[PDB]
Amino acid sequence: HHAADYVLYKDATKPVEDRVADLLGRMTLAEKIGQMTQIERLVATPDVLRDNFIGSLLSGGGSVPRKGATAKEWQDMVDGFQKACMSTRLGIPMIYGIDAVHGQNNVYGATIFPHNVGLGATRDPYLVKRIGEATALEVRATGIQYAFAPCIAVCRDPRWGRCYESYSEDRRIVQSMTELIPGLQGDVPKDFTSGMPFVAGKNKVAACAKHFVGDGGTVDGINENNTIINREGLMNIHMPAYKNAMDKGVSTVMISYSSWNGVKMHANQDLVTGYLKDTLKFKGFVISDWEGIDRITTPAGSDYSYSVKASILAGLDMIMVPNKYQQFISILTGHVNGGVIPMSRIDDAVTRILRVKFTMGLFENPYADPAMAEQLGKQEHRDLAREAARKSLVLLKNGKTSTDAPLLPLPKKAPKILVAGSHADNLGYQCGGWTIEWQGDTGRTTVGTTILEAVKAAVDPSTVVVFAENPDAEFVKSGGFSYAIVAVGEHPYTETKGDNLNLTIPEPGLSTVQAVCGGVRCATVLISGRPVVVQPLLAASDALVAAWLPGSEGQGVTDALFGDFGFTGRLPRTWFKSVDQLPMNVGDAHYDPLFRLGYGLTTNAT
Ligand SMILES: *[C@@H]1O[C@H](CO)[C@@H](O)[C@H](O)[C@H]1NC(C)=O
Ligand SMILES: *[C@@H]1O[C@H](CO)[C@@H](O)[C@H](O)[C@H]1NC(C)=O
Numbered sequence: 001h002h003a004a005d006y007v008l009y010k011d012a013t014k015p016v017e018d019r020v021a022d023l024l025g026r027m028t029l030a031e032k033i034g035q036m037t038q039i040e041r042l043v044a045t046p047d048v049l050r051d052n053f054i055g056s057l058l059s060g061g062g063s064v065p066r067k068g069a070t071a072k073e074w075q076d077m078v079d080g081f082q083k084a085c086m087s088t089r090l091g092i093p094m095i096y097g098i099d100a101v102h103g104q105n106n107v108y109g110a111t112i113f114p115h116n117v118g119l120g121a122t123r124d125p126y127l128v129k130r131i132g133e134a135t136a137l138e139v140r141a142t143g144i145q146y147a148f149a150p151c152i153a154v155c156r157d158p159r160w161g162r163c164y165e166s167y168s169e170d171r172r173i174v175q176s177m178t179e180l181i182p183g184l185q186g187d188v189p190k191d192f193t194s195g196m197p198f199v200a201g202k203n204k205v206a207a208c209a210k211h212f213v214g215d216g217g218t219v220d221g222i223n224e225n226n227t228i229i230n231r232e233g234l235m236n237i238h239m240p241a242y243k244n245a246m247d248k249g250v251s252t253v254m255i256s257y258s259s260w261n262g263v264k265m266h267a268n269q270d271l272v273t274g275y276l277k278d279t280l281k282f283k284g285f286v287i288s289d290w291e292g293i294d295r296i297t298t299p300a301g302s303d304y305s306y307s308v309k310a311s312i313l314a315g316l317d318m319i320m321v322p323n324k325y326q327q328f329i330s331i332l333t334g335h336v337n338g339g340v341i342p343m344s345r346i347d348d349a350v351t352r353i354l355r356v357k358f359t360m361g362l363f364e365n366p367y368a369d370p371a372m373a374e375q376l377g378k379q380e381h382r383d384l385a386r387e388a389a390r391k392s393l394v395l396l397k398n399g400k401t402s403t404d405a406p407l408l409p410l411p412k413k414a415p416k417i418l419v420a421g422s423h424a425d426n427l428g429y430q431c432g433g434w435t436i437e438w439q440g441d442t443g444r445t446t447v448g449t450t451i452l453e454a455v456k457a458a459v460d461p462s463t464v465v466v467f468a469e470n471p472d473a474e475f476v477k478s479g480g481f482s483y484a485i486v487a488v489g490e491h492p493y494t495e496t497k498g499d500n501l502n503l504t505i506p507e508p509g510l511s512t513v514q515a516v517c518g519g520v521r522c523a524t525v526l527i528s529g530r531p532v533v534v535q536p537l538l539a540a541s542d543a544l545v546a547a548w549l550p551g552s553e554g555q556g557v558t559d560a561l562f563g564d565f566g567f568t569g570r571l572p573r574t575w576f577k578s579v580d581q582l583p584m585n586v587g588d589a590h591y592d593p594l595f596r597l598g599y600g601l602t603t604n605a606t
């Protein structure tokens with residue numbers, strides 16, 4: 001189709017399957033295995049990317065070109081890696097992936113949306129679609145083309161450190177929130193075939209349904225552990241949202257570290273090939289988790305040759321190595337040359353990776369668009385995050401007795417008010433894990449508005465706002481306050497660091513709520529990733545709000561506290577009476593919640 005040097009896979013007018021087959025038929029085994037290899041930016045250089053024919057890069061949590069880097073700095077980093085990949089013999093562009101799981105959350109100045117538990121409280125799938133749309137724009141502002149989201153885990157035990165990454169313990173709510181996918185990727189056309197990958201073009205990103213499968217069903221909520229459940233239960237609880245993801249054209253699926261009835265997911269051919277590929281007809285690419293194949297063995301990493309064979313024969317397509325790429329490539333090449341892994345398996349993995357890259361337009365637009373840098377932290381997206389934070393809040397109490405005046409909404413005009421607690425003026429605590437650092441962090445880690453700053457922006461100019469992080473009761477009683485807002489809760493955590501058998505918030509938290517509420521009427525704002533022991537906090541408080549991990553836009557909290565909007569959120573999880581009840585889900589003989597799934601009080605706007 002015309003120039004003397006015409007090569008069909010470079011022709012943007014040709015169907016994707018024809019371009020995939022044309023390119024695959026030209027590739028050496030080194031070029032094929034390179035496509036299957038994803039490496040961390042920290043081990044990448046131009047020569048490494050070219051010499052090893054690398055297919056993908058990622059940033060892990062906190063892996064950034066520098067602290068405070070601008071959107072342009074991110075684009076220049078991604079473009080520098082892409083120029084090396086485009087300089088190989090075949091010029092196959094890399095795809096760059098990142099955990100953009102509540103906005104583009106590793107990046108300074110990105111909008112930080114509420115984490116998924118609070119989004120489940122909104123029961124609003126169109127809000128979540130709009131969040132996917134804004135997230136895709138902020139990820140593309142940094143030159144990145146691929147987000148590892150949504151987590152469609154159905155968390156069945158809140159002792160799991162990833163419970164906050166699950167929309168709900170009710171798979172129907174998780175299924176509804178798969179609307180994140182067409183937000184991130186764009187809507188699929190009317191005649192679309194379920195299981196095909198889709199991305200609309202350069203203003204959207206590839207998505208990732210994760211972690212396949214049963215990551216929210218592990219014993220005692222131990223992260224990465226064993227999910228013990230019959231096939232009926234796996235299929236009725238943990239699997240359904242993957243079918244919704246197929247129908248919405250999710251481009252990739254990431255495998256879980258967890259096991260199902262003792263079989264590692266990263267080595268489970270029956271489920272990855274037999275079910276996901278051969279039954280659901282998934283035609284995008286399957287990616288490992290970070291060192292997921294290493295963790296097939298006990299101890300992890302003790303037989304990496306086996307890890308490679310087991311994972312590739314199970315049906316995984318791309319391996320998040322992410323550091324020991326030379327060993328990964330050498331071992332896989334040896335297995336293929338030895339006849340241990342057939343070429344048909346390599347060709348299927350490369351077909352799927354190429355299919356996603358061609359479909360999303362990566363060969364046509366391999367480089368960043370500098371005009372997109374301005375989308376990062378845009379005020380329209382902050383207004384959306386503020387809407388989502390307010391909708392996520394669940395009002396659990398609003399008066400100590402049935403005859404008390406309702407405390408919320410609070411008046412904006414009062415002579416003097418108190419804002420108190422470790423979480424009232426701490427942006428890192430209100431964002432939680434996966435924000436700037438992998439585990440999150442404390443203090444003013446990015447651009448946003450704390451609860452204290454939100455109160456100061458809300459109240460009448462005559463209202464004096466006093467801040468005290470941990471006042472004693474005497475200070476409160478002597479202060480001439482009309483009321484207090486006191487915010488406390490969990491510290492940031494991610495993955496195994498968040499596994500927690502006691503679910504009791506760190507002190508001082510309860511002590512501060514008791515001191516403040518003992519001195520003046522108080523609204524307690526509980527920041528957490530999950531239900532936590534709450535009876536003592538409730539006993540002390542006039543009103544109590546479960547705010548989850550609401551992100552950078554603390555005005556979503558004050559929008560409800562001062563009655564600009566009514567409270568509407570409803571619990572997306574069961575609130576237990578005691579951790580000795582766990583696991584405790586609807587239907588269990590022992591179901592005896594403090595607050596049931598779906599519970600929430602309301603207010604009317606003033
Ligand atoms: C579950 O956790 C235990 C205790 O740490 C560990 O020894 C075991 O390997 C884990 N099992 C799985 C399937 O990950
Ligand atoms: C609860 O568990 C967490 C996470 O393991 C731990 O850091 C904390 O100290 C524990 N709190 C207790 C035992 O009161």
Ligand SMILES: *[C@@H]1O[C@H](CO)[C@@H](O)[C@H](O)[C@H]1NC(C)=O
Nearest residue numbers: 398406566601602603604605
């Ligand atoms: C809010 O308004 C409705 C009338 O539209 C009323 O029925 C309801 O009781 C009001 N207040 C609360 C706290 O629900």
